[PDB]
């Protein structure tokens, strides 16, 4: 959310909100300098070669990804100045998201989404899951562990491949059992996608090239929505997908989109999920929340924290909006659950952020990106927290002219698209 700190990449570590850290989960990698921009949220301005050892190289893969747009450059984000500009860019976008009620609510939900304490072999004991913490190195050389909900990190090889991932449990499915787990988002505020407005279905030579630029704030909000679903453990099983036939590219005939994605997009695309399926999901997670409340009612002890058992049980009572009777027993209130579930899956959607920000954006996933641009949103003459690219009192305020890369061209550099696909 709001970042009440003036962070500069070169600022000395203090073991509190500026420190070298390690993610116990990701093997024994090298410590990376990170910044805590808000309670429960850290930012690591480095290319992600830590979360997955399998993705250590930053060069284009042997087999090019079959996606509309991709971009590679192993040198991006390797200098202190870039890391400083990245930190400032990510911070500015969080503030832009924080500039509307929708964004403020989403960020608060995320900060409230503390991963459940269910890592014990003793059903009656509350214990943390190591995968939901990081080790913060201190200036004296020692270190302390700390729980957190979200980490924003630089991209891996494909610079514009933004995603929301997390460390799993050996048996539990944390993102889908209501527990939740710390989310890691690969993101970059230094690039953005180019798209064309939906065809008028009448007189329009497809020979275009993605004239309009996507607002970085929407792209980040998109990933944060996924993080939200995953922190509350209500993400839709990735096995549930929607098959779509497409004639857009040579040698391609279809597209597969997960229900999670459709839900996150909102608007028209979310309607592709059947009513029967929707109710199935809501009831499914409702049951997961009941199991949690049940686990909390059977908890007799807690290990690993200075805090009391009552307090830690209360944290989750508040996270899941559980009801507590005069005898101290927890239960899931059907009305409360529905309102919370509805807010996380139907109010927090990409389409609604588009409405709140008042920007041009694709209407459906079927309108594929066509280009990639290098941008620089830190300077106020380029982009602002309140208006993004469409600066008020200028030619850029009307008809989304600020996002028109042909009108507001000083804000963009068209880059090479590494895609192997050929548009038909």
């Amino acid at each position: 959310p709001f970042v009440n700190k003036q962070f500069n990449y070169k600022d000395p570590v203090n073991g509190v909100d500026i420190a070298y850290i390690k993610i116990p989960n990701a093997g024994q990698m090298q410590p990376v300098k990170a910044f805590k921009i808000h309670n429960k949220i850290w930012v690591i301005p480095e290319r992600d070669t830590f979360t997955n050892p399998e993705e250590g190289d930053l060069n284009p893969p042997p087999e090019a990804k079959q996606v509309p747009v991709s971009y590679y450059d192993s040198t991006y984000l390797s200098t202190d100045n870039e890391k400083d500009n990245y930190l400032k860019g990510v911070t500015k976008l969080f503030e832009r998201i924080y500039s509307t009620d929708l964004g403020r609510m989403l960020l608060t939900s995320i900060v409230r989404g503390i991963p459940f304490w269910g890592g014990s072999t003793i059903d009656t004991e509350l214990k943390v899951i190591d995968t939901n913490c990081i080790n913060v190195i201190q200036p004296d050389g020692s270190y302390r562990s700390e729980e957190l909900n979200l980490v924003i990190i630089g991209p891996s090889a494909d610079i514009i491949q933004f995603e929301c991932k997390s460390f799993g449990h050996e048996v539990l499915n944390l993102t889908r059992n209501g527990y939740g787990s710390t989310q890691y988002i690969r993101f970059s505020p230094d690039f953005t996608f180019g798209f064309e407005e939906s065809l008028e279905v009448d007189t329009n030579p497809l020979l275009g090239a993605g004239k309009f630029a996507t607002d970085p704030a929407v792209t980040l909000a998109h990933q944060l929505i996924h993080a939200g679903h995953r922190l509350y453990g209500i993400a839709i099983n990735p096995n549930r997908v929607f098959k779509v036939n497409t004639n857009a590219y040579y040698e391609m005939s279809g597209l597969e989109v997960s229900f999670e994605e459709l839900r996150t997009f909102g608007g028209h695309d979310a309607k592709f999920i059947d009513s029967l399926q929707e109710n199935e999901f809501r009831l499914y997670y409702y049951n997961k929340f009941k199991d949690i409340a049940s686990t909390l009612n059977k908890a007799k002890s807690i290990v690993g924290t200075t805090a009391s058992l009552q307090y830690m049980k209360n944290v989750f009572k508040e996270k899941y909006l559980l009801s507590e009777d005069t005898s101290g027993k927890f239960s899931v209130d059907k009305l409360k659950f529905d309102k919370l579930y509805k807010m996380l899956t139907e109010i927090y959607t990409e389409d609604n952020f588009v409405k709140f920000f008042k920007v041009l954006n694709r209407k459906t996933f079927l309108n594929f990106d066509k280009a990639v641009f290098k941008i620089n949103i830190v300077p106020k003459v380029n982009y602002t927290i309140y208006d993004g690219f469409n600066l008020r009192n200028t030619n850029l305020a009307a008809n989304f002219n600020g996002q028109n890369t042909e009108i507001n061209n000083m804000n963009f550099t068209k880059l090479k698209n590494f895609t192997p696909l050929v548009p038909r």
């Binding site: 990701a26 509309p68 608060t108 503390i114 929301c164 040698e251 709140f356 696909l421």
Partner: protein, 59 residues
């Protein structure tokens, strides 16, 4: 043209209703946890697959 703002104010209404229960952050008190011992991660933690853009562009 002005229908967008109407939708915005409408959504704001629903958020206002949730604000009383979801408006503030939690787990705000100054607690600490035991240090997590960094053991030999030969096969430590795994990763729960993320969401790759529009996802699978089948041939």
């Amino acid at each position: 043209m002005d229908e967008n703002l109407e939708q915005v104010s409408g959504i704001i209404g629903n958020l206002r209703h949730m604000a009383l229960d979801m408006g503030n952050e939690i787990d705000t008190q100054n607690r600490q946890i035991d240090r997590i011992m960094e053991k030999a991660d030969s096969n430590k933690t795994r990763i729960d697959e993320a969401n790759q853009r529009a996802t699978k562009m089948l041939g």
